[PDB]
Input
Amino acid sequence: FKPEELRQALMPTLEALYRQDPESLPFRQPVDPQLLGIPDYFDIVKNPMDLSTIKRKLDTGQYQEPWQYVDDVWLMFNNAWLYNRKTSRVYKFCSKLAEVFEQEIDPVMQSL
Ligand SMILES: CC(=O)n1cc(-c2c(C)[nH][nH]c2=O)c2ccccc21
Output
């Protein structure tokens, strides 16, 4: 795939996640376990991922192939599902972002 064409294809799905308010707010920066008061976080979550890390990777040609991008998005959600209780605000927000991403990524990958 062409970098600019791969970037262009996937772009709208990322922007879809950013457009969700307030659901995208806990996902815009890397989790800071000190600030958030969750000192066990890095013991439980061994490979953190967030929107800003994805965007920087996308925009700088780090994704040579779509599933690399998809795997990073999926990791972000699975991290939050793993760490947070199912009744928590962040967990509910996560499911919302995940539902949105599936409905966006299907028609994209059904062409690339
Ligand atoms: C992604 C993730 O697991 N988390 C995100 C937050 C968070 C809140 C509630 N406000 N701003 C944030 O970044 C968070 C808080 C506690 C545990 C996990 C959290």
